[PDB]
Design a protein around this ligand. Structure first.
Ligand SMILES: [K+]
Ligand SMILES: [K+]
Ligand SMILES: [Mg+2]
Ligand SMILES: [Mg+2]
Ligand SMILES: [Mg+2]
Ligand SMILES: [Mg+2]
Ligand SMILES: [Mg+2]
Ligand SMILES: [Mg+2]
Ligand SMILES: [Mg+2]
Ligand SMILES: [Mg+2]
Ligand SMILES: [Mg+2]
Ligand SMILES: [Mg+2]
Ligand SMILES: [Mg+2]
Ligand SMILES: [Mg+2]
Ligand SMILES: [Mg+2]
Ligand SMILES: [Mg+2]
Ligand SMILES: [Mg+2]
Ligand SMILES: [Mg+2]
Ligand SMILES: [Mg+2]
Ligand SMILES: [Mg+2]
Ligand SMILES: [Mg+2]
Ligand SMILES: [Mg+2]
Ligand SMILES: [Mg+2]
Ligand SMILES: [Mg+2]
Ligand SMILES: [Mg+2]
Ligand SMILES: [Mg+2]
Ligand SMILES: [Mg+2]
Ligand SMILES: [Mg+2]
Ligand SMILES: [Mg+2]
Ligand SMILES: [Mg+2]
Ligand SMILES: [Mg+2]
Ligand SMILES: [Mg+2]
Ligand SMILES: [Mg+2]
Ligand SMILES: [Mg+2]
Ligand SMILES: [Mg+2]
Lengths: 98, 157
RNA sequence: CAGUCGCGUAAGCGGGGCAUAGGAUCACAAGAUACAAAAAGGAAAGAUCUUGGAUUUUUGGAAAAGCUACGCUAGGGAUAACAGGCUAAUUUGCGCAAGAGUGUACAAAAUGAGUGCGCGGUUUGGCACCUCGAUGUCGGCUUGACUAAUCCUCAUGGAUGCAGAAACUAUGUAGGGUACGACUGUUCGUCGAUUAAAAAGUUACAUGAGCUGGGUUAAAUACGUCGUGAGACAGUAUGGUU
RNA sequence: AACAAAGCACUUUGCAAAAAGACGAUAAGUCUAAGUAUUGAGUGUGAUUUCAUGUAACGAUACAACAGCUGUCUCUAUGAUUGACUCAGUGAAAUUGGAA
RNA sequence: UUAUCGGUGAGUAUGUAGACUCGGAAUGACAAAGAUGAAUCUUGAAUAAUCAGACAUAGAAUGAUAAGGUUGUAUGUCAAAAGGGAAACAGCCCAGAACAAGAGUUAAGGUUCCAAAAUUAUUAUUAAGUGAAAUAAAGAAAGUUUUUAUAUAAGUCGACAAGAAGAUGGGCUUGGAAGCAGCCAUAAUUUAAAGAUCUCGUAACAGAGCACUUGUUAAAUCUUAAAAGCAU
RNA sequence: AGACAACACUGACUAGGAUAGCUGGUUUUCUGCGAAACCUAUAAUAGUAGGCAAUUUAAGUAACAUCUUAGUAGGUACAGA
C-alpha cells in the first residue's frame, strides 16, 4: 500500500497503564451493580453471565490485556490497540490455547 | 484414488476456503495415532500441494532406502487448486498437525535426519514428535497436567 | 355470501394438478350486455363482461447493417498511446538454508537435481489513484550525477583437485578507465582488428522550451493478405513544415 | 513508381425527321455536327519488340558499386561581416489567482 | 501359498467439509408486559435531494492466501465534522466547534531538550545505539541471563603419560581385502580395559588416533546438556 | 490530388429559422432542521420515474428507541464422524 497508517505493533508503558485502569474501572461498575442488587436479593442475567465467563484485571494475564487473537498473524496474536474503539470496548477472553 | 490424486472431478471448481482454525479446544490430528514418530507443522496453517508432499515422501525414502520401515501419511490432497482451469491438488492443514508417521527397526537419530530433511522440502516449520506425548490445543501443548478445561477457564493468573 | 352440481353412511370435501419453471395495452375476431345513438326512427362506429390468435423472447412490450487513417461538436478522462503510483505472477535480477548427485578416493577445491526461507524493482505482466507526448519506448549526439551485484588496474583466503606459470572460486575495494570500425531499420544483435580491459545498471528513451528524427501519427502511390463493398492490416516499399 | 500520353483492344452509334452520348424544376431545344461506321461516344490497356515479358533512349525517381573530391569526420583553429554587449533616441508581445 | 492387486463385511478407528450437520452457541430478528428516555414514531396537508461513494476492523468470494485490485455482509468514520493525538495525514485513536474568561476538571496521548507536564518510585533483562511511534524470514553460533536436570574430593572438567590381549591375515571376495572395496557373520573368550571395528592410511601388510582403561596435576557454590528471554 | 471554385471546401460565403439527458456560471445577512451514493422500472447504467426518505406544522399516539422478565422462529461459529 501507499497510504501510511503509522500504528506501532506494540503499546507503550503509558497506554498499558490506562488499559489496566480501564479494565479495573469496568470491574467496579459490575461490582457496584452486583452488590447493589444482592442487598435487595435480586439478580440480572447479564450480570451473572459476566462474572461467569469474564475475568477481573487481577486474574488476567499480561498477554490477555495487551493482545488479542488474530488468525492472520504469524503467532495468532495481535496488539489490542488495533481493535476498533478498543478504548471503549470490552475484550478480555481469547480462544483457548491461542 | 490415492492420497495425492483423489477420486474427484477436476472440472467442478472449488472455492478457496480456509484451513481449519480450531478455536474451541479441539485437538484433532495433533497426536501420533499409528506410527512411533511423526512430523508436526508447528508454526501456522497452510495449504500444501500434491507436489510438495510427494517430494517430502521421496526425501524420506531416499534417506531411509534399504531399511525396513512403514510410512503412514496423515493428510490427503482433496482440494482442487484452480490457477487461471484446474492446476493441482492440495490439502489444508491446521497448526500443530501431524503430516507423516513412521515405524520400523530404525534408530531414532536416523529418523530425525529423515524428517529433518523432509521439513526443508515442505513449506513452513516442522517439529519431530514421538508417540505418547500430549496433544496440542491451539499453540499450547497439554503438558504438566494441563487440561483442555484449564485453557478455557477465564481465570488463569 | 348467493346461485347449483358431484362424491360420501356421516362428518364433510371440491373455485384443477405435492410445492417451486407460460407477458399487458392497442388493433383484430367470436359470443353475451341493452348502456349511449350528433334533427328524428334505425344503423354504423363506440361502452361494459367473457374468450381467442404473440421466440410481442431486448419477455413493463422499436418494423432496423456497416465504414471513416479526412472525420465534426458537446463532454468524461471508468487508463485508453506514455510517464509516475500500488503489486511482484514472470524475468535475461539475485542471496541464503539444506545436500540427491558429479568430483578415480573424498559432500561442501569445484560442482548443486527437484525444493524451502528471502531481498530487490531491471524484462514480460496484473491493477487503474491519475487524461497528455505516446505503438521499437526506444536509438544516436551533447553533457552529466549517482549505485555497486567488478571487465581492467590494487590488497588477499581456499584449492588429496595451489610445484612454477596460467586459470578457477571467494573475500576487500567503484580512484581512473571500459576505445575504434564493418554489416544490421534499432538496443536486440553479428563480425573485423587493436587493447591492461574493450563489464553492467538507475536517473520521466536521465537529458528534443539542448540538437537529431533513426523514431513518435497521418493525407500520395504500388504490391500482398482479409472483406460483397466502403474499408481494414502489429503488413511491405518510396515520399512526407519537428 | 502516381495522372496523362502516342499506340493497341473491346462495346456501342445507319443519321426517315432524335445517330448514340451529355445537358434541360422540363420541355422546346443546344453541344455532338453544317460530322456520317476510316464518324461520334464510352471502357480498359499504355510506344516498339516478344505475346505479361526482354532491349536502345530518357529521369531534380529509388538503390548499389567504382574513381576523384573535399572541415562530413579524426579535431578543430584562425580570420571577416551582421546581431548579441555598452551609451543616446524611439518603444512591442505571448504571459500573469496572490507571492517574503 | 502371500502381512501382493482390487472388492466385500465389521470398527463407539484416524482425518477431510460452500452445496455433511446427530450436538450446538453468542449475536441478530419477531412480538407481549413494565420501566426509563433527549418526540426520537405514525398520520394529514405541502414537498426535496440522492441512484460510480471512499477507507478502517472482522469474515468471505475472486486473484496468486498479490495489489491503495474487484465484489457481498456486519459496525463505524469521512463524505457534510472543526478541535486534541497518530512527526506531516478525508477515512485510524479520542471528541461533536454559539462567544469569552480559568496555572479550573478530564479523554486519547504523553511528561530530558526542541515542546505544556516525572531526568517520579520498584524488580529484572539488553551492551547490540539493539531499541527509543511502519518488528524483513528460515537459519547459524563457547554472546549473555534465568529456569529445569545434572558431575563432583569416591578428584568433576581440561591437559598430560601409557595401555587399547589373544584365536585372527574372521569366512567369502579379489591381482591384492590382513579391523577399515564389497558380501555375510560378528552368541564367545580373557582382561585395568579393548568394535571381527568409528576417523585416517597401504597395491595389500604395516603404521597413527578413537570408543574403551589406569595414573599424575588439580576445583570446596566454579561440571555438562536442554529449553526460555534479550542481543550478534 | 476528395484538386480548385476570392479568411472557409469529404461541398464556399451570406441572411433567416434550432436544440443540446453534455459543460460552465447562478450575486445580501441571520436563524431552525438536515440527507444519499440503496432497491425497482427504463435501448438503461453521465439520465429519469416510483419507493426508501430530508424538510415544513397540524392532528394523534397502547407512538418510536433501549433495558428487564417469560416466550417464539432459525442451524452460523464451534464441535463431531
Ligand atoms: K482542401
Ligand atoms: K443539528
Ligand atoms: Mg505513500
Ligand atoms: Mg520448510
Ligand atoms: Mg339518429
Ligand atoms: Mg344525422
Ligand atoms: Mg425489459
Ligand atoms: Mg418484473
Ligand atoms: Mg477513477
Ligand atoms: Mg562417490
Ligand atoms: Mg573479485
Ligand atoms: Mg592458498
Ligand atoms: Mg600461482
Ligand atoms: Mg584518491
Ligand atoms: Mg538514449
Ligand atoms: Mg526538456
Ligand atoms: Mg490511402
Ligand atoms: Mg490492392
Ligand atoms: Mg523529394
Ligand atoms: Mg504495346
Ligand atoms: Mg439524340
Ligand atoms: Mg496502367
Ligand atoms: Mg506497365
Ligand atoms: Mg519529366
Ligand atoms: Mg537604449
Ligand atoms: Mg478499493
Ligand atoms: Mg459529493
Ligand atoms: Mg477531522
Ligand atoms: Mg512526538
Ligand atoms: Mg495546573
Ligand atoms: Mg517543559
Ligand atoms: Mg537506531
Ligand atoms: Mg452510506
Ligand atoms: Mg445522461
Ligand atoms: Mg440439529
Amino acid at each position: 500500500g501507499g497510504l501510511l497508517w503509522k500504528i506501532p505493533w506494540r503499546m507503550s508503558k503509558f497506554q498499558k497503564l490506562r488499559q489496566r485502569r480501564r479494565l479495573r474501572a469496568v470491574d467496579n461498575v459490575v461490582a457496584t451493580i452486583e452488590n447493589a442488587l444482592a442487598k435487595k436479593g435480586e439478580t440480572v442475567k447479564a450480570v451473572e453471565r459476566w462474572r461467569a465467563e469474564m475475568p477481573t484485571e487481577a486474574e488476567m494475564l499480561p498477554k490477555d490485556k495487551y493482545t488479542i487473537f488474530d488468525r492472520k498473524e504469524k503467532r495468532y496474536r495481535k496488539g489490542i490497540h488495533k481493535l476498533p474503539k478498543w478504548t471503549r470496548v470490552s475484550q478480555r477472553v481469547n480462544p483457548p490455547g491461542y | 484414488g490415492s492420497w495425492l490424486e483423489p477420486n474427484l472431478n477436476r472440472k467442478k471448481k472449488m472455492m478457496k476456503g480456509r484451513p481449519r482454525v480450531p478455536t474451541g479446544g479441539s485437538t484433532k490430528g495433533t497426536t501420533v495415532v499409528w506410527g512411533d514418530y511423526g512430523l508436526r507443522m508447528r508454526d501456522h496453517h497452510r495449504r500444501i500441494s500434491a507436489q510438495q508432499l510427494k517430494l517430502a515422501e521421496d526425501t524420506i525414502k531416499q534417506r531411509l532406502r534399504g531399511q525396513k520401515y512403514r510410512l503412514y501419511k496423515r493428510v490427503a490432497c482433496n482440494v482442487g487448486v484452480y490457477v487461471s482451469s484446474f492446476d493441482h491438488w492440495a490439502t489444508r492443514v491446521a497448526v500443530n498437525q501431524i503430516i507423516f508417521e513412521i515405524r520400523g527397526q530404525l534408530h531414532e537419530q536416523v529418523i530425525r535426519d529423515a524428517f529433518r530433511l523432509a521439513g526443508h522440502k515442505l513449506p513452513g516449520l516442522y517439529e519431530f514428535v514421538k508417540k505418547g506425548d500430549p496433544p496440542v490445543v491451539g499453540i499450547t501443548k497439554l503438558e504438566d497436567g494441563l487440561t483442555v478445561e484449564d485453557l478455557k477457564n477465564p481465570r488463569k493468573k
